[PDB]
Amino acid sequence: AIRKKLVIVGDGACGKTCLLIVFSKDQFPEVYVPTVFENYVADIEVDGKQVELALWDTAGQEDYDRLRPLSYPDTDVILMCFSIDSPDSLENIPEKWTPEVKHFCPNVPIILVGNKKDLRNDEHTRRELAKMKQEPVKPEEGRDMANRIGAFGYMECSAKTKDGVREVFEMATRAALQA
Amino acid sequence: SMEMDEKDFAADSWSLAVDSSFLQQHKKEVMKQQDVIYELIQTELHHVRTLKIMTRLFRTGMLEELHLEPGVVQGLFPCVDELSDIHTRFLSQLLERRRQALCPGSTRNFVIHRLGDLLISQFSGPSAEQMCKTYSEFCSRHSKALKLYKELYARDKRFQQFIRKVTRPAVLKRHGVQECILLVTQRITKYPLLISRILQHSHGIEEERQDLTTALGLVKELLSNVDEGIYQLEK
Ligand SMILES: *CC(=O)Nc1cc2c(cc1Cl)OCO2
């Protein structure tokens, strides 16, 4: 089967490690959630096409500007992650992550992924954000950002509840297949 | 990888690796701390196993089955013998610390109380200097190693045969040549993540909290120098 490469980028604690773990295991880890993700090669069948999707994370690389780009060679799709409970992580998308992803991966499709969508109705999250004069990322703010950065699309998921996780990785496979 | 160690790290966590009657005699904070220490060792064991696939399966296989220039093999797997010695020694020390902590009559029940001392030795002095120079060299030759691999795969029919043949086993699904090189470059950036989470559950003994805080500062210092020493070479 055809082999495609995926790299997930985004600020630290934007849920990117959790997202890769929950998809590569097919559930939220009941006993222990690992701290790190090594790599994974998923066998995905999307729209009748069989693909080998190699998964890679950039967690731990966020402060090392010369090490981090070594993750980019031959990437076919980028999941550009942000957390819906962290409006500040969305502000770092167009001026930090997008210029870098477009410089090292020109023509590579980017999916803007809003993680932790379950925290949109979490009372503790809304209270913590209200103290810092903020609120959880509204769905139209994510769509407006994806539109502004020329992303292939906008998607939302929750690694805690597993809602939307399968759709994100099937869509990333379709985006990687387009040439 | 040896069967004894593979079985010892087969479970998803420390709570699943030990007998349930042993787990139930411990405080939740000890279970949580041990879960991250077990992940550090389990991922170090997988890392040493990635380096053994590079040296014995890929590198040695090319020397014994192909008529490639040994300079081409060196370009494909830079500093792998050096990396293998550093991490095999570190893994050896971690595994002996686990064996020392084993409950008599058991080969699986253990609680590691000291780890910081071992991490300070690894990430300080001559030991850290050798890792910094080795990783600065490996990461500067990383892109050239991928380009050399891709050229050999697209021009040499015998190299393609060799690759298709050795990577055929299921156990090697995510351990092809390029996957092994990226797994190795990414290893060093996992240590602060693993040590910070271990530290978060090591406030019981104060000497341990300090030793883990020193080890954390030493790893970040190593990453900073490795990152400063990188200068990507070209094919
Ligand atoms: C010291 C020790 O760990 N003993 C031990 C041995 C076994 C089980 C529990 C304990 Cl606490 O279960 C089977 O073997």
Pair of tokens at residue B81: 């013998």
Angle at A19 between CA A16 and CA A21, to 5 degrees: 110
Are the C-beta atoms of A97 and A62 separated by less than 8 Å?
no
Q: What is the 3-state secondary structure (H, E, C) of B59-118?
A: HHHHHHHCCCCHHHHHHHCCCHHHHHHHHHHHHHHHHHHHHHCECCCCCCCECCCCCHHH
What is the side-by-side strand order in the sheet with A49-57? A40-46, A49-57, A2-9, A77-83, A110-115, A153-156
CA nearest B47 in A: which residue? A38
Phi, psi of B123 (to 5 degrees): -105, 25
**Cα–Cα distance, B17 to B19 (Å, whole number):** 7
Are the C-beta atoms of A40 and A24 separated by less than 8 Å?
yes
Pair of tokens at residue A66: 């010369």
Please classify residue A102 by burial: count the beta carbons closer than 10 Å to its beta carbon, then call 0-12 exposed, 13-18 middle and 19+ buried. Answer: middle
Calculate the CA dihedral of residues A135, A137, A141, A143 and round it to 10 degrees: -170
Q: What is the 3-state secondary structure (H, E, C) of chain A?
A: CEEEEEEEECCCCCCHHHHHHHHHHCCCCCCCCCCCCCCEEEEEEECCEEEEEEEEECCCCCCCCCCHHHHCCCCCEEEEEEECCCHHHHHHHHHHHHHHHHHHCCCCCEEEEEECHHHHHCHHHHHHHHHCCCCCCCHHHHHHHHHHCCCCEEEECCCCCCCCHHHHHHHHHHHHHCC
Task: For residue A23, say whether it is annotated as part of any ligand binding site.
Answer: no
Task: For residue A12, say whether it is annotated as part of any ligand binding site.
Answer: yes
**Cα–Cα distance, A17 to A9 (Å, whole number):** 10
**Alpha carbon B189 to its chain's center:** 11
- Residue type at A131? K
Resolution of the coordinates, Å: 1.9
Phi, psi of B181 (to 5 degrees): -65, -40
Interval between CA B99 and ligand 1 midpoint (Å): 15
B15 interface with A at CB cutoff 8 Å: yes
Find all residues with CB under 8 Å of B48, minimum gap 6, and list them: B1, B84, B87, B88, B91
**Cα–Cα distance, B136 to B232 (Å, whole number):** 10
Across the strands, what pairs with A3? A52
CB contact under 8 A, A71 and B16: no
**Cα–Cα distance, A16 to A83 (Å, whole number):** 9
Are the C-beta atoms of B76 and B149 separated by less than 8 Å?
yes
B200 interface with A at CB cutoff 8 Å: no
CA nearest B184 in A: which residue? A38
- Looking at beta carbons, which residues of chain A come within 8 Å of B36? 35
Q: At what angle do helices A16-25 and A165-177 cross, to 10 degrees?
A: 90
**Cα–Cα distance, B187 to B125 (Å, whole number):** 20
- HSE (side-chain half, CA atoms, 13 Å) at A113: 32
Interchain CB contacts (distance < 8 Å): A and B: 78
Q: At B169, is the secondary structure helix, strand, or coil?
A: coil
Radius of gyration for the alpha carbons in chain B, expressed in angstroms and rounded: 20
Calculate the CA dihedral of residues A144, A146, A148, A151 and round it to 10 degrees: -160
Across the strands, what pairs with A77? A6
**Cα–Cα distance, B19 to B16 (Å, whole number):** 8
Are the C-beta atoms of B155 and B163 separated by less than 8 Å?
no
Are the C-beta atoms of A3 and B177 separated by less than 8 Å?
no
Residue with tokens 């097919």: A26
Give the technique used to solve this structure: X-ray
**Cα–Cα distance, A30 to A27 (Å, whole number):** 8
Task: For residue A48, say whether it is annotated as part of any ligand binding site.
Answer: no
**Cα–Cα distance, B177 to A73 (Å, whole number):** 14
Radius of gyration for the alpha carbons in chain A, expressed in angstroms and rounded: 16
Q: Which domains does chain A have, with CATH numbers?
A: 3-177 (3.40.50.300)
Residue A108, Cβ neighbours under 10 Å: how many? 19
Are the C-beta atoms of A168 and A157 separated by less than 8 Å?
yes
Residues written for chain B: 235
Interval between CA A82 and ligand 1 midpoint (Å): 45
